[PDB]
């Protein structure tokens, strides 16, 4: 797990990584992987989260401070943020 | 321009397409393209917009009604929505 950019507590970062890890074990399709992570975070840390999972994409978003992480798990990039 | 999924007025859909078209002429990096579109929509339709541009990604997001578009410009996918 390589964190490329973050504005997030270390504990919440580890939870994002763990949640993404669980999502990748279960789901093959990026949209489903994203949905699993997004839903877990809405549940655990309140709405409203958004999650993008992919190999080739750029983004520009607005996030609540302390609630932004962008990382790779293997060759997969994951963007997860609250807005 | 191929619209894949929209919850947005026909008029705003046209604006999203024109905006993305202009961005692709000015920029070739996904992040820059996304930033162009996001900033223009924030300015014209109020914050808070988010934009994802890329050939390979899946997403799961939450959007205000009438403020969501997912389309292709050629082979590049664009997701633009307001939280």
């Amino acid at each position: 797990a390589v964190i490329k950019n973050a504005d997030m507590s270390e504990e919440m970062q580890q939870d994002a990584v763990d949640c993404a890890t669980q999502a990748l074990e279960k789901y093959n399709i990026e949209k489903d992987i994203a949905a699993y992570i997004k839903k877990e975070f809405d549940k655990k840390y309140n709405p409203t989260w958004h999650c993008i999972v992919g190999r080739n994409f750029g983004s520009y978003v607005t996030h609540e401070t302390r609630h932004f992480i962008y990382f790779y798990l293997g060759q997969v990039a994951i963007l997860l943020f609250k807005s | 321009a191929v619209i894949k999924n929209a919850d947005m007025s026909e008029e705003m859909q046209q604006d999203a397409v024109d905006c993305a078209t202009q961005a692709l002429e000015k920029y070739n990096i996904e992040k820059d393209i996304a930033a162009y579109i996001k900033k223009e929509f924030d300015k014209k339709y109020n914050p808070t917009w988010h934009c994802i541009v890329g050939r390979n990604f899946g997403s799961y997001v939450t959007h205000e009604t009438r403020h969501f578009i997912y389309f292709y410009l050629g082979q590049v996918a664009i997701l633009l929505f307001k939280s």
């Binding site: 950019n5 504005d7 607005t62 401070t65 807005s83 | 990096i29």
Partner: peptide
Amino acid sequence: NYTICAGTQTDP
């Protein structure tokens, strides 16, 4: 106001 903008780009 607790918000800020950020951008991301995938590796080549």
